[PDB]
Design a protein around this ligand. Structure first.
Ligand SMILES: CCN1CCN(C(=O)N[C@@H](C(=O)N[C@H](C(=O)O)[C@@H]2N[C@@H](C(=O)O)C(C)(C)S2)c2ccccc2)C(=O)C1=O
Ligand SMILES: CCN1CCN(C(=O)N[C@@H](C(=O)N[C@H](C(=O)O)[C@@H]2N[C@@H](C(=O)O)C(C)(C)S2)c2ccccc2)C(=O)C1=O
Length: 262
């Protein structure tokens, strides 16, 4: 148990919830894990895998990102700030990817999933890039039920950090596709209260949040610290009762402990 791990355990203790953290410091490829091999519900953090899978398809189906996809009134789910503007019209897969990632649009995510042949198509992509842990089982919005002990739509912090590193800094995607994914993550609108809140102001980052029942509050990020090689950081948090409140502050605290421990 390292000093950082002990600090994360203390944070967890005062949160009353269950915290999972995985850091990969690309300066030396070292990792810091806290419940790194335990499963957590991904919620919206799964949107990165779906968007990446579509980017991979676009490497060989060249005009795929410009392909129009019909948005019908029946497609709307619980949160669709971008898709609802286009009901009875169309959005391209690039527009759907940007909406899913940067606005966490759930209808947009469902269109990515459908393009991949269902939730299993997203899992298949994960397996293709060496992630043997990730599993997507349902569409939006039920993939956010986040029931304790339920393996559906979960992953481990270790697996997600390794995957995010491969996708954003490694070669799981072609260069142009990797750059697109990084651009989308850096333009996220929903992350200032989570991991990024715990980082020094001078650092830059891209991230994808997730939220669900059981007060499930998640974030996965690629970070560029001032004067250092980039990091990949995953912070997952989930609570004992279905109606628990969101705790983005716990993710910010975890990120601050990680930054102070570098
Ligand atoms: C089947 C019943 N059921 C299970 C629970 N559930 C969700 O927990 N959905 C979650 C969901 O769709 N979460 C999405 C996600 O994790 O990307 C988006 N992130 C939420 C956020 O950042 O606050 C959102 C409300 C912008 S939607 C949700 C979490 C908190 C508040 C509202 C929705 C549902 O939507 C739902 O219908
Ligand atoms: C000769 C060995 N060999 C080399 C060629 N190959 C593949 O190209 N497999 C591909 C593979 O296993 N693709 C996966 C699969 O077939 O479930 C997933 N299906 C694709 C789709 O539905 O369009 C995906 C892009 C969502 S990934 C692969 C894709 C990306 C990264 C690595 C592998 C093989 O699998 C294979 O057997």
């Amino acid at each position: 148990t390292s000093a950082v791990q002990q600090k994360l355990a203390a944070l967890e203790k005062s949160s009353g919830g269950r915290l999972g953290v995985a850091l990969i410091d690309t300066a030396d490829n070292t990792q810091v894990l806290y419940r790194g091999d335990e499963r957590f519900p991904m919620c919206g953090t799964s949107k990165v895998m779906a968007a990446a899978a579509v980017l991979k398809q676009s490497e060989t189906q060249k005009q795929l990102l410009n392909q129009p996809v019909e948005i019908k009134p029946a497609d709307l789910v619980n949160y669709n700030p971008i898709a609802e503007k286009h009901v009875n019209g169309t959005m391209t897969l690039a527009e759907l990817s940007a909406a899913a990632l940067q606005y966490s649009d759930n209808t947009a995510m469902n269109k990515l999933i459908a393009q991949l042949g269902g939730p299993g198509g997203v899992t298949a992509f994960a397996r293709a890039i060496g992630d043997e842990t990730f599993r997507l089982d349902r569409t939006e919005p039920t993939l956010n039920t986040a029931i304790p002990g339920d393996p559906r739509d979960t992953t481990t912090p270790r697996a997600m950090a390794q995957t995010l590193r491969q996708l954003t800094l490694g070669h799981a995607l072609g260069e142009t596709q990797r750059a697109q994914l990084v651009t989308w993550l850096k333009g996220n609108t929903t992350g200032a209260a989570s991991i990024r809140a715990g980082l020094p102001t001078s650092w830059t980052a891209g991230d994808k949040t997730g939220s669900g029942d059981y007060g499930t509050t998640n974030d996965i990020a690629v970070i560029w610290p001032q004067g250092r090689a980039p990091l990949v950081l995953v912070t997952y948090f989930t609570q004992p009762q279905q109606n628990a409140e969101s705790r983005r502050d716990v993710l910010a605290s975890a990120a601050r402990i990680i930054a102070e421990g570098l």
